[PDB]
Design an enzyme around this catalytic site. Sequence first.
Site, PDB file in Angstrom:
ATOM      1  N   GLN A 117       0.834  -1.197   0.000  1.00  0.00           N
ATOM      2  CA  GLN A 117       0.000   0.000   0.000  1.00  0.00           C
ATOM      3  C   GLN A 117       0.870   1.250   0.000  1.00  0.00           C
ATOM      4  O   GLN A 117       1.796   1.352   0.796  1.00  0.00           O
ATOM      5  CB  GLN A 117      -0.906   0.044   1.231  1.00  0.00           C
ATOM      6  CG  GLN A 117      -1.812  -1.166   1.389  1.00  0.00           C
ATOM      7  CD  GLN A 117      -1.211  -2.270   2.227  1.00  0.00           C
ATOM      8  OE1 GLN A 117       0.015  -2.462   2.266  1.00  0.00           O
ATOM      9  NE2 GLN A 117      -2.073  -3.030   2.884  1.00  0.00           N
ATOM     10  N   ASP A 140      -3.840   1.279  -3.368  1.00  0.00           N
ATOM     11  CA  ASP A 140      -4.324   2.307  -2.443  1.00  0.00           C
ATOM     12  C   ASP A 140      -3.991   3.755  -2.874  1.00  0.00           C
ATOM     13  O   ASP A 140      -3.654   4.595  -2.042  1.00  0.00           O
ATOM     14  CB  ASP A 140      -3.790   2.055  -1.025  1.00  0.00           C
ATOM     15  CG  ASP A 140      -4.464   0.890  -0.330  1.00  0.00           C
ATOM     16  OD1 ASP A 140      -5.162   0.094  -0.976  1.00  0.00           O
ATOM     17  OD2 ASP A 140      -4.280   0.772   0.894  1.00  0.00           O
ATOM     18  N   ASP A 161      -7.511  -1.575  -4.977  1.00  0.00           N
ATOM     19  CA  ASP A 161      -8.236  -0.781  -3.994  1.00  0.00           C
ATOM     20  C   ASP A 161      -7.800   0.660  -4.096  1.00  0.00           C
ATOM     21  O   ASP A 161      -7.486   1.294  -3.088  1.00  0.00           O
ATOM     22  CB  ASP A 161      -7.970  -1.296  -2.581  1.00  0.00           C
ATOM     23  CG  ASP A 161      -8.344  -2.745  -2.384  1.00  0.00           C
ATOM     24  OD1 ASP A 161      -9.152  -3.326  -3.156  1.00  0.00           O
ATOM     25  OD2 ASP A 161      -7.842  -3.305  -1.389  1.00  0.00           O
ATOM     26  N   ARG A 221     -14.688  -4.064  -4.226  1.00  0.00           N
ATOM     27  CA  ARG A 221     -14.864  -5.072  -3.196  1.00  0.00           C
ATOM     28  C   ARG A 221     -15.073  -4.380  -1.840  1.00  0.00           C
ATOM     29  O   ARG A 221     -14.688  -3.219  -1.663  1.00  0.00           O
ATOM     30  CB  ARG A 221     -13.675  -6.032  -3.158  1.00  0.00           C
ATOM     31  CG  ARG A 221     -12.330  -5.396  -2.838  1.00  0.00           C
ATOM     32  CD  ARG A 221     -11.211  -6.399  -3.053  1.00  0.00           C
ATOM     33  NE  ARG A 221      -9.950  -5.920  -2.490  1.00  0.00           N
ATOM     34  CZ  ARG A 221      -9.027  -6.694  -1.931  1.00  0.00           C
ATOM     35  NH1 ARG A 221      -9.206  -8.008  -1.854  1.00  0.00           N
ATOM     36  NH2 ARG A 221      -7.909  -6.155  -1.447  1.00  0.00           N
ATOM     37  N   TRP A 223     -14.401  -3.252   1.689  1.00  0.00           N
ATOM     38  CA  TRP A 223     -13.381  -3.164   2.722  1.00  0.00           C
ATOM     39  C   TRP A 223     -14.032  -3.356   4.089  1.00  0.00           C
ATOM     40  O   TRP A 223     -13.442  -3.961   4.983  1.00  0.00           O
ATOM     41  CB  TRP A 223     -12.604  -1.845   2.623  1.00  0.00           C
ATOM     42  CG  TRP A 223     -11.418  -1.756   3.530  1.00  0.00           C
ATOM     43  CD1 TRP A 223     -10.751  -2.791   4.117  1.00  0.00           C
ATOM     44  CD2 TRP A 223     -10.720  -0.567   3.909  1.00  0.00           C
ATOM     45  NE1 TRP A 223      -9.711  -2.319   4.873  1.00  0.00           N
ATOM     46  CE2 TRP A 223      -9.665  -0.955   4.761  1.00  0.00           C
ATOM     47  CE3 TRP A 223     -10.882   0.787   3.615  1.00  0.00           C
ATOM     48  CZ2 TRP A 223      -8.778  -0.036   5.325  1.00  0.00           C
ATOM     49  CZ3 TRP A 223     -10.011   1.711   4.196  1.00  0.00           C
ATOM     50  CH2 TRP A 223      -8.969   1.291   5.035  1.00  0.00           C
TER      51      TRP A 223
END
Length: 299
Positions: A117, A140, A161, A221, A223
Site C-alpha cells: 500500500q 491504495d 483498492d 470489493r 473493505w
Amino acid sequence: ESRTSAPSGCLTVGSDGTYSTIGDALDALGSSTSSACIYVASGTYEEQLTIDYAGDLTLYGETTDTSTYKDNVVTITHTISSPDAGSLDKSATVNVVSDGFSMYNINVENGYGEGAQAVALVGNADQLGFYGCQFSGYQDTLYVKAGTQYYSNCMIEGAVDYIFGDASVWFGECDIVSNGAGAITASSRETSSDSGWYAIDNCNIKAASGVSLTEEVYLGRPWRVLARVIYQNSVLSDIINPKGWTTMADGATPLYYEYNNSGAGSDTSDREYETSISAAVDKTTVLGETWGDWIDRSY
Ligand SMILES: [Cl-]
C-alpha cells in the site's frame, strides 16, 4: 481558461516565485482562518505534504487549459509504502485534513509501485474539491478516508483498492485508469447510520495504455461490510470482469449499483453482489443539500 500566473491574492511557488517549495508557501500561511490561495508554477516538487490550514485554502497549478488534467505541468511526488511509513496516512504524498480545501490542475503521485500500500493523496476532511487533478499509484492510490468530497475531470490511476475509505464522494467526468489487476473501489462504509455513498458519474473506466487487463478488473470489493458504490452514466471498458464485483470483508452485504452505463464492460447479465436501482443518484444524496455552496459550478 489558461492559468499561467497567480490568481488575485495567491502566494507564488516556483523557480521564479516567492517560494521555492510548496511546503514553504503552506508554512507561510501560518495560523490564519482567512481564505487563502497558492499558485504553483511548473515543476516536479519532491515533497510530502500535510494540508492542515485553518482557513479555506485553494491550491492552483499552472496549466494552459484548466478544464482538463491533461496539460498539467505541476507534479508533487514522494515514495514510501505504509509498512515503512507506519500507517496509510503517513505514506501519503499529500494528506488533506483541512475542511473546504480545493485543488486545481495538480498531479500527485506515490512512486512506490506494486508490492504494498502506498497512498498518493488522502482526503480526510469535508467539502474537498478536486478539479483537473491526477492521482497516481498502484495499491491504495486515492484514500477517500472521510468527509464529503468532489472530484471533477480528474485522472485516478491504480490497480488495487485504488479508491478506498469512507468518504461520501462524487466522481464526475473523471478518467479512472487501471494499471494492474484488482478492484477499483474499496469502501469502508460499516454501519447503517452512515449516510455516505461513492458515486462514479459520467466517468470513463479503462486500462492504462500498454497494459492488457481484459476482464481482470472489478468495480469494487467491500473493505467493510456495508460498502456502498454506484457506477452510473459511465463508460466501462472490457477490463471489467463479467461478475462486476468481488469479495473482501467476511459477511459483507454491500450496496453495489449500476445505472445506465455503456461500453464493452457494461453487460450486467453475469453480475454478482449487486442491488437494483431505478434512477441515478444526485449530489444532494451523496454530498448533502449544501453542495452548491462549495462546489465550483463555473468549472
Ligand atoms: Cl483521523
